[PDB]
Amino acid sequence: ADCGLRPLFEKKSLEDKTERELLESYID
Amino acid sequence: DFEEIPEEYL
Amino acid sequence: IVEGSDAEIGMSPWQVMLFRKSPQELLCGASLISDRWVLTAAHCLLYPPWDKNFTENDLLVRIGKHSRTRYERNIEKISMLEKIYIHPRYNWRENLDRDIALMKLKKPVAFSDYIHPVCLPDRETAASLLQAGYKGRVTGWGNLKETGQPSVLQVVNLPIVERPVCKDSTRIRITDNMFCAGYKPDEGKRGDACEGDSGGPFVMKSPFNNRWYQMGIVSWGEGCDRDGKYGFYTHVFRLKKWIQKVIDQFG
Ligand SMILES: C/C(=C\S(=O)(=O)N[C@H]1CCN([C@@H](C)C(=O)N2CCOCC2)C1=O)c1ccc(Cl)s1
Ligand SMILES: [Ca+2]
Ligand code: NA
Numbered sequence: 001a002d003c004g005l006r007p008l009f010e011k012k013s014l015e016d017k018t019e020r021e022l023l024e025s026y027i028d
Numbered sequence: 029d030f031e032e033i034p035e036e037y038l
Numbered sequence: 039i040v041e042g043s044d045a046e047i048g049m050s051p052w053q054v055m056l057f058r059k060s061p062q063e064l065l066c067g068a069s070l071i072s073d074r075w076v077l078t079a080a081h082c083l084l085y086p087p088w089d090k091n092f093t094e095n096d097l098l099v100r101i102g103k104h105s106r107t108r109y110e111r112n113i114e115k116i117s118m119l120e121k122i123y124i125h126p127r128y129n130w131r132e133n134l135d136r137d138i139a140l141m142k143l144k145k146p147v148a149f150s151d152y153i154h155p156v157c158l159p160d161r162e163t164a165a166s167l168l169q170a171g172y173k174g175r176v177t178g179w180g181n182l183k184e185t186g187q188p189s190v191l192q193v194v195n196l197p198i199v200e201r202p203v204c205k206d207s208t209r210i211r212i213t214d215n216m217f218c219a220g221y222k223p224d225e226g227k228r229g230d231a232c233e234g235d236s237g238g239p240f241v242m243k244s245p246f247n248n249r250w251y252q253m254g255i256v257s258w259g260e261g262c263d264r265d266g267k268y269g270f271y272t273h274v275f276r277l278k279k280w281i282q283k284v285i286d287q288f289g
Contacts, residue, residue, distance in 0.1 A: 029063075029107050029187075030062045030063065030064075030107045031107055031108050031109040032062070032109065033062070033098075033109050033116060034109075034116075037098055037116045037118070038059055038060075
């Protein structure tokens with residue numbers, strides 16, 4: 001149910017240093 | 029190289 | 039991982055280290071998909087050409103790790119294997135087609151800040167995210183170079199490559215159960231998995247529901263981070279029918 005939501009990131013609404021690079025590549 | 033793990037796991 | 043960087047603490051809480059009992063050494067990467075199941079590459083467990091055929095008792099899985107060599111007291115959890123399941127059509131004879139295996143743990147692992155499962159993709163998430171140019175992330179404790187070893191978990195983000203380009207980069211027969219990723223030459227950026235990273239996850243963060251999905255398994259490469267070459271990954275969604283069958287029957 002909680003898969004893929006990281007306790008130290010998504011669960012606390014903190015972003016890691018490079019995840020934005022992935023989001024920026026999802027252009028379509 | 030590798031630090032020894034607790035014997036219980038071996 | 040070649041040309042990557044140190045992972046942040048808890049950045050990849052599904053990361054698993056496949057560890058040989060004796061001699062004590064890193065065998066491969068792997069990933070946590072539930073409190074009792076770990077996903078890896080079949081070749082990490084079975085590869086007759088190199089006289090590799092591990093049994094449950096030969097191995098341990100170490101979960102929640104960051105340091106490569108250190109015993110991370112109060113953080114990592116070490117689990118024993120109950121049963122190994124290898125895809126029945128894993129093609130070790132030729133090209134590593136269907137390079138996938140599951141490992142059932144003897145006891146469930148407790149989730150924590152450092153231990154947490156990754157999601158597996160459904161048809162729609164795969165269709166939306168598995169597109170050339172879209173970047174995924176590879177993590178592992180493998181070699182820093184083809185020809186040394188990291189102190190801590192490494193991370194690299196790499197773009198999925200067009201199928202024709204993947205096929206044209208190699209003499210190996212590529213199948214629908216594989217995809218390739220990495221930068222093209224002169225693209226200004228580099229990076230790749232390397233020996234010791236195989237079996238580990240290629241993940242993507244869904245922009246729809248903000249969850250991480252494991253789209254690939256580090257499968258094979260011809261060298262590491264060579265110009266004109268790309269890393270190849272087991273296509274997790276293509277093999278999900280088998281994954282579900284194993285979990286449904288033996289879970
Ligand atoms: C592990 C590795 C680059 S390697 O050069 O260190 N190892 C090579 C040597 C032979 N192989 C494959 C083609 C192979 O036939 N193997 C290795 C895995 O066990 C089965 C036999 C490699 O992956 C990788 C680079 C990119 C990805 Cl993805 S992974
Ligand atoms: Ca070719
Ligand atoms: Na390359």
